[PDB]
């Protein structure tokens, strides 16, 4: 049940009973536990070729999660006034506590939004997640002017960003990739950046 | 059953008799060595003193601290109710898991957000941050001397005696018409809505009103 919620995430490639080691927090042995219940309640299934895929069933308990999250952040940030340092803290929390009815008259509240304040796509209830903003920076080959339409939800990717003077709507100037290097020359704010891959992967775009 | 969830009891249940090791036990639904054990840590932790004539008095801390457990837990209903549209019953079930949870920063943004409320949908105040609690109204329906017209300021949070004066149409802000105290009746006869009521005196303790 907490697990699930890293299987979708990785959807942007093969799987293995030991990514589930160094990347989660308990054993490869003390988890392979997890996956002989999640089958035989029909949560997920086991596909070769991508190594593992969560079924309709899996996904729609999934979108919950990240609908529940992304409102919590809207509210905490446009009407508390929160900053990233502040969601990292309390955001979690609250969240596991707070009840569907609670969720429903605050999206009400919010008056619907659609996207949360950086980048994410809010799925309507019992409706499938389907992320509007896929063009990743890694992926973008034209150089030219783009736009930083949403970044990935992690912490410190966040404060990196913001300490690098990344805003989540900001317009972007791609310089170009390094075939051997592996950075990404960036311009931003008349400014010149470079960015690993790791860092690229998790930013998308759109020109 | 933690401290805090005596310290709400100990203060109201003192306004002015004698608290008992038995009062407690019996009012919290626990074991007396599980009360003997409490008030040993709310003593070493300076949060009231042993007292002769009240049982127990609370210090300044106390009562700070039982101001705070009041300001979380009024700015939350406000907002579940103004903000949310929540409903009495909705309340009971969510109410308290929010209070239980929540930092003092989402409450002092919560304030701000809610534009520095000064009571609760059901009349109790709110105080301010570091405040001791003040009520507004304090004036029972049982102390009403006079008779004819009022307006109901206030009740306790108290969910069935909240079930209570709704299905009986008593609501905060409503004019009631007191008709009196019978001297053995013991009874107060009201008059809301154009319905007459009769009230017992347990539950004419927790109504309060101001001489309209």
């Known amino acids: 049940e907490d697990y699930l919620k890293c299987l979708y995430e990785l959807g942007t ?26 089958l035989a309640e029909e949560l997920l299934i086991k596909d070769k070729k991508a190594g593992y895929l969560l079924t309709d069933l899996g996904l729609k308990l999934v979108s919950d999660l990240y609908r529940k999250h992304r409102l919590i952040e809207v509210f905490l940030v446009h009407h ?5 340092e502040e969601i990292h803290e309390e955001a979690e929390v609250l969240e596991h506590t707070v009840s569907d009815h609670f969720v429903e008259r ?13 980048g994410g796509t809010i799925p309507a209830k019992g409706e499938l997640l ?19 339409a949403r970044v990935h939800d992690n912490f410190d990717l966040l404060t990196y960003l913001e300490r690098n003077g990344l805003q ?16 990404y020359s960036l311009e931003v704010d008349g400014q010149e950046i470079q960015l690993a891959q790791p860092i690229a992967q998790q930013i998308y ?3």
């Open 205 to 207: 775009v759109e020109k």
């Open 13 to 38: 490639n093969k799987i293995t009973n030991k990514e589930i080691a160094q990347l989660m927090q308990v054993s490869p042995p003390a988890v392979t536990e997890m996956m002989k219940k999640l």
């Open 80 to 84: 508390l006034g929160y900053t990233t």
């Open 130 to 148: 389907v992320e509007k903003h896929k063009l990743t920076l890694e992926e973008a080959k034209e150089k030219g002017d783009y736009i930083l």
């Open 168 to 183: 989540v709507g900001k317009t972007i100037r791609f310089l170009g990739y390094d075939d051997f290097s592996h950075l």
């Open 106 to 118: 605050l999206d009400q509240l919010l008056d619907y939004p659609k996207a949360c304040p950086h």
